[PDB]
Amino acid sequence: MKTITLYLDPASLPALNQLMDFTQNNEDKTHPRIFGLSRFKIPDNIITQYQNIHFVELKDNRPTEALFTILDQYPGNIELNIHLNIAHSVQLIRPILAYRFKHLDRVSIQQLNLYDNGSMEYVDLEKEENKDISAEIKQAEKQLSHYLLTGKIKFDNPTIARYVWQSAFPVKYHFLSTDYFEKAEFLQPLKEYLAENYQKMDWTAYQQLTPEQQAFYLTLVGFNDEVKQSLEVQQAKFIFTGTTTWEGNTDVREYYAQQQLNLLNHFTQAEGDLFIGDHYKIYFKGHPRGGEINDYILNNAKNITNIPANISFEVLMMTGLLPDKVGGVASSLYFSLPKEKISHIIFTSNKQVKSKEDALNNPYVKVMRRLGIIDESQVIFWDSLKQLGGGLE
Numbered sequence: 001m002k003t004i005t006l007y008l009d010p011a012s013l014p015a016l017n018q019l020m021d022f023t024q025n026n027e028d029k030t031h032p033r034i035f036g037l038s039r040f041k042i043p044d045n046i047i048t049q050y051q052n053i054h055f056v057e058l059k060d061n062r063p064t065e066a067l068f069t070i071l072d073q074y075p076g077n078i079e080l081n082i083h084l085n086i087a088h089s090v091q092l093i094r095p096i097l098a099y100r101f102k103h104l105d106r107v108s109i110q111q112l113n114l115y116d117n118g119s120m121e122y123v124d125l126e127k128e129e130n131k132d133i134s135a136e137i138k139q140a141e142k143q144l145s146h147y148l149l150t151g152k153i154k155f156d157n158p159t160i161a162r163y164v165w166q167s168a169f170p171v172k173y174h175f176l177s178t179d180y181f182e183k184a185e186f187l188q189p190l191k192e193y194l195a196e197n198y199q200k201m202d203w204t205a206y207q208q209l210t211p212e213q214q215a216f217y218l219t220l221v222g223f224n225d226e227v228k229q230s231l232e233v234q235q236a237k238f239i240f241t242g243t244t245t246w247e248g249n250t251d252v253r254e255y256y257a258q259q260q261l262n263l264l265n266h267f268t269q270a271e272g273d274l275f276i277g278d279h280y281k282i283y284f285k286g287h288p289r290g291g292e293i294n295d296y297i298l299n300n301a302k303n304i305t306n307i308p309a310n311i312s313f314e315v316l317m318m319t320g321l322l323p324d325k326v327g328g329v330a331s332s333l334y335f336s337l338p339k340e341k342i343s344h345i346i347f348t349s350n351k352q353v354k355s356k357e358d359a360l361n362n363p364y365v366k367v368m369r370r371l372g373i374i375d376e377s378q379v380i381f382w383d384s385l386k387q388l389g390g391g392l393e
């Protein structure tokens with residue numbers, strides 16, 4: 001009998017956790033492994049250090065049929081150790097269940113580990129408030145039972161169905177916020193149901209790795225030594241969170257770069273509404289899709305250190321390298337931050353948010369307020385901030 005480990009995630013946070021798992025186990029060069037991590041390209045010179053390492057694409061949040069070709073290479077008794085994104089867990093496991101059903105005499109499921117996509121799961125759970133959660137749970141377990149057979153998907157409640165895997169397999173959920181589950185009154189039947197099958201997502205695994213493994217992990221996640229060192233400087237640090245564009249009544253991208261620079265000044269300069277303090281070392285963390293806007297911001301900002309835009313913000317939490325303060329344009333990344341690290345979150349114009357009032361009603365912001373992670377005073381609408389100049393370098 002042999003174990004095969006599958007690492008599936010279309011997004012970022014689960015993949016970052018899954019790459020940690022792989023790193024933790026990286027002394028084993030031959031354990032069969034299947035990577036379907038859409039956002040992460042494992043470098044060739046890491047891959048060739050391993051045997052029985054396989055790669056699969058995801059298509060509409062499902063591993064392609066190329067998964068069957070890989071699994072056919074192991075014709076004896078196999079046990080699958082599966083790692084999933086919670087939000088997308090149903091779609092991700094479909095081809096696995098189909099395969100198991102075909103080969104139920106020799107293929108079996110060892111266990112599941114499931115990790116939050118991020119704020120998504122929480123936003124989706126809020127929509128379930130005022131349903132009979134106990135009733136939703138039991139129904140989802142029943143419908144999961146049929147899915148288990150054939151690999152046929154039908155769930156009346158797709159959100160709750162994410163949380164009933166324990167009715168079929170050994171499972172461990174890794175939650176961004178256990179406080180959410182323990183404090184949300186309406187979710188008490190779900191929290192009680194999950195029993196000891198969940199834990200808070202651990203951000204400390206990196207500290208127990210060998211130095212060699214730590215470097216391996218950083219390589220996996222596109223975090224080079226220059227950037228790490230910059231984030232090891234023994235001084236107070238502030239990271240500004242850049243964005244792409246918004247509804248500014250212009251399609252001139254230089255405008256959006258200019259305005260983001262104005263927002264940054266409100267943190268860096270004493271004259272700013274949001275002045276962080278004179279003693280902070282300042283960093284710019286551009287949006288991964290900012291493109292040439294990031295170049296403009298970097299070029300015009302003074303006394304600032306770039307953190308390559310392509311790195312997922314959550315890598316910082318994963319590696320213990322979060323700064324003292326984080327501020328700037330709003331992103332779901334704020335959901336995952338300890339409250340003492342949040343300065344001010346600035347919201348830009350879109351269809352849903354045209355004011356501070358609207359920003360306070362943003363789905364992840366509302367949860368954050370209720371959990372006491374942020375005060376209303378920490379929520380700023382972008383065009384409330386006057387034009388200010390920057391400093392000298």
Ligand SMILES: Nc1ccn([C@@H]2O[C@H](COP(=O)(O)O)[C@@H](O)[C@H]2O)c(=O)n1
Binds near residue numbers: 012242309312314330
């Ligand atoms: N300045 C920024 C903004 C977003 N991001 C990343 O992009 C992801 C998606 O952000 P949004 O939900 O705000 O679109 C986050 O999980 C975060 O990793 C980043 O790494 N740096």
